[PDB]
Every structure is written in structure tokens, then in C-alpha cells.
Amino acid sequence: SSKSVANIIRKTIQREQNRIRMLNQGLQAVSFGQVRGVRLNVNVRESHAI
Amino acid sequence: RLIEASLYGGISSAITRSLRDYLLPENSGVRKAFQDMEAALRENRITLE
Amino acid sequence: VERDEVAAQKRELEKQIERLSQPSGAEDSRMIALAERFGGVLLSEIYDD
């Protein structure tokens, strides 16, 4: 019930954010014309955060 | 979609639309607990109908 | 008698299935709360992958 569900959801979210952050680093400093880097921006929706 | 988008090149429209569907794996742990806990009610409701 | 015996098998099957359900199938009745009441993590969950 309650808190434990929130904790498993939070840990899953945290793990996904961290893995994305690791993938994200391999793409730093890639030169394509005037583009110099690429990222996958991950964010949490407010209506679900509250 | 992946292969042909690579073949022709460019920022694929379809990949861009459904980005979460492509980049995130689906996790069962959050769900199956509640499917099993929910089971007794589901059967009862179906029986009543 | 045949009805009751088959019922016993079905009950055993559901209990067996239920043990493997959630969150990382274990003695979930108390273990999840026991896992958070100390600053720890369930070992079976560490070896999920």
C-alpha cells in the first residue's frame, strides 16, 4: 500500500533517468555542421509529480 | 521503421512522435502484484454479471 | 470427491503462482515493509536481472 508503491515507482524512474544519462554522454561533442551535441531530455510531468 | 528511417536518412517523424515508446522498456513489476490482488474482485464481478 | 480433489489441486496452483508474483517474488507478506524499515534492499531484487 501507499508509500511502498511510491518508492518502487521512484526507484524505477531514477534508474531510467540514470541509464539515459549514461547513454547521453556517448553523444557529447559530435560535430554535424553547426550542431555540436545531442541529448535526450527527460522530465517528470507535474500532474503526476504531485 | 528503424531500418528504413536509417536507410533514407533524416530526423524520422514517426520516431520523433513516439519517442517514449521506443526508448523506454516496459516494466511488469509495478503491475502484476495488483493484478493478482485484484483477481478476487474481478472474478466476483464477472460472476455477478 | 473428484470435484474436491481437483479443487485442492487448483488451490495449490494459485498459491504457487501467487508466490512468484510481486514485487520481486518472495515472502512479500512482510518482507517489503521489513525492507524499507531498515536502510536496506532485498537481495533477490538486487539479483533481478
Is the minimum CB–CB distance between A16 and chain B shorter than 8 Å?
yes
Residue B23: beta bridge partners? Answer: none
Q: What span, in angstroms and rounded, lies between the C-alpha atoms of A17 and A43? A: 9
Please check whether residue C27 touches B, CB under 8 A. no
Distance from CA of A19 to the nearest CA of B (A): 10
- The region that residue C43 occupies, defined by phi over 0 for left and psi between -120 and 50 for alpha, beta otherwise, is alpha
Cis, bond preceding B25 (omega within 30 deg of 0): no
Which chains would you list as touching C if contact means 3+ CB atom pairs under 8 Å? A, B
- Taking residue C24's Cβ as centre, other Cβ atoms within 10 Å add up to 19
What percentage of chain B's residues is helix, strand, coil (to nearest 5)?
75, 0, 25
Length reported for chain C: 49
Hey, which chains touch A, using 3+ CB pairs under 8 Å? Answer: B, C
Question: Resolution reached, in Å?
Answer: 7.8
